[PDB]
Amino acid sequence: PRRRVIGQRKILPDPKFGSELLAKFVNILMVDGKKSTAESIVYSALETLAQRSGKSELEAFEVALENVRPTVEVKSRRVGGSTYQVPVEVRPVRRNALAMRWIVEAARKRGDKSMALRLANELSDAAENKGTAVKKREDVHRMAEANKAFA
Amino acid sequence: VSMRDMLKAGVHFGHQTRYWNPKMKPFIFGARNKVHIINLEKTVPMFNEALAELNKIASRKGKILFVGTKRAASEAVKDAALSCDQFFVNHRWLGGMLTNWKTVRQSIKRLKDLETQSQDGTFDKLTKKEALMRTRELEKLENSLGGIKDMGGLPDALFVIDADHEHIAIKEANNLGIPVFAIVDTNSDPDGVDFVIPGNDDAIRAVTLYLGAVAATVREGRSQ
Amino acid sequence: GQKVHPNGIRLGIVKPWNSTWFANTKEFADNLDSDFKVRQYLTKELAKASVSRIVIERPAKSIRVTIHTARPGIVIGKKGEDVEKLRKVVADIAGVPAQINIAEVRKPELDAKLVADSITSQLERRVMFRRAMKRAVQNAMRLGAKGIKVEVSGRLGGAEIARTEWYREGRVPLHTLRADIDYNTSEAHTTYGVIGVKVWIFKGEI
Amino acid sequence: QRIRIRLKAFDHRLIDQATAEIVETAKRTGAQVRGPIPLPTRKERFTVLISPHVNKDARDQYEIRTHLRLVDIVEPTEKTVDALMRLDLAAGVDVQISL
């Protein structure tokens, strides 16, 4: 990206709900190009989350994502022999991506029996803004507010 | 050409007062509207006298190099030049065309090899890049050297549109003793010019007049 | 860096194969070795016959050698004699019956192989390498080469430190697949070892 | 019955020239001919190390394409049989006949 700027591939929407957002999610959860088996785990987790937690499947997703979404972050930088930490205000599209990514990662780093149950309980926890993924947003802010001086 | 005949084309129009070169005091009628007005009393006899010597030169099989690289007039100089079986330079003059002719001559050989090969040698079997890449080279050489491609030697005279714009070509001529005939506008330096023709050197209507006149007298001088 | 063999890269494009017979895997190896043994035999016996190139093809149960030579009378010998004696031993080496064809090399100074051999033989005679090269170039151009270069490598003039040197007149676009580039090789076995000669000749395009 | 000729060669322009010869000859000698059909090209390949010692990543990648043609001749009219059967064909073409 020295010279060549680019657009971004605009992936197809989630097959079940027609959501580009959930397509960004299944892909992020996907491993070894196992798309078939990835969306299976995302839905069953949404189905587990939907059925027994007040429904509104897309909305349930947002309530949880709303909570792990980070408004600002820090970008490392090396000036006069010094590695300064510059807090940057982060753009909406990626805001979702980090939010989704930390939810997925916290789910695999969990004790429950399957990825679907884990994913479901991560969303639930995030929905109540608690657990690992939310905590990942908070460290980002503690780390950001600290270097507030250099913005 | 006639005083009446010239006036219509606007040969009499010159540059502003602010841009004049003082050496050209004799040939300025005066000025109006902060613009210099050239003297057509002075222009015509001097111009006719230019045509005579050109007519003489052409009648001993003399080679005439038309020079005028203004973008606006580049085409007109070509047609003017070809209409009398002579040679031209109609895009950026390469410094040393005359003084370094032996080296620039090689580029002429290159030109011919290229258009000859692309036609009689034909190729058209290429690699797909060479079609344009060789045309690229040929395209360039054509603008640069299309007009003198068959000149063979050093010209016997130069006819120049705008002495300041073409100061390089006029300077090479000077060094080689080649006589220079030039349209020399109020802002320019007439010192390099053996036969100074003072009039507008921009306006396509004015340019074509001298040039149209020049190419015509070559043919008369040729027709003998 | 390393350059691609300019004869090889152009095979199928503007350069012909020198072996052009067909054969299945069964006998492809045997045919290819038989080719080697005949080319070798002929290349020795005709060393002083300016043989620049040997084409071999194998129609049905036959083999026919074409000897491209700048000295056909030599190769042929008085009333077919030398042709004939070559035939009878090619046929031995080949196994199958054999026929020999002879193609004149009209202008050998444009033939890279005979250029390279000519310089090779000249280094063995004790000619100076700059001369031999420069005679080759000059000759090649006055006869209408679009370009030529000849390289010489290793221990020029018996120098202790081995050197590589080339001369080049005109035009030699080696990256142009279209370009008729005639390329070949020769080794000069000298009193102080081996001097390799490479030669390129550009003859126009398509 | 029918006579079918399988043609194989390493060079394409040369193979269908040999094919063309045969078909035309047949068509002129009043034989009826199915084909020529292009049967799939079997291209062997070879990858060889390019250096005399070590440098395992430095290689040449060669291939030999073997071209295939099927010439099917419906009526075996003897004039046709003699027409074909002393044709002068490119040496580097292998010709197979089925009977």
Add this chain to the structure above:
Amino acid sequence: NQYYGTGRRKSSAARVFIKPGNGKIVINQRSLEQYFGRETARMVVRQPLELVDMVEKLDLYITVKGGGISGQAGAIRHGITRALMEYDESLRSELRKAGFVTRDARQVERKKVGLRKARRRPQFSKR
């Protein structure tokens, strides 16, 4: 007379024969459900019947070989649209905008000497 469209993708190639009447689909003598165990892929063959409307309007009789699941479903997608355009060709502007007219040209990239795959490079040790 049948209205036809060829479609292909990766190493697959699908032939697609259109005729009016119904919402019937028979790939390789088999049913749409039977042939594709994945229901998402089922949706892509249906797609060319979205912007262009079939409910019980035309029969598509199709077949395919080569490639895999999504290759065969992509290829059939492609071939239908061509058979739709065959039927009118006005329809296209819709199909263009859909992305369905295009022949997705992305083939698997060859494996290269000195590399572990088409691009994956042998791990590099500094010492």
Add this chain to the structure above:
RNA sequence: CUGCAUGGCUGUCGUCAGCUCGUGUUGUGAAAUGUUGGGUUAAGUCCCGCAACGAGCGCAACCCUUAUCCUUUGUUGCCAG
């Protein structure tokens, strides 16, 4: 045995954008300019500018393959009616 006497082959910086010549011009001269600049290109790519005008090798093109289609040919491939 010597790759520190060699040929041929190969790695490598690196498919990086470089390397040069004639004539001209500048400097007593080694040399310079061209190929010092402003933009832009994958690129000494291209364009303006320019005491340089031009040209050659390398860049690109011509080559193989892949993506759409047309004509030819249907067996051992194909099966719409």
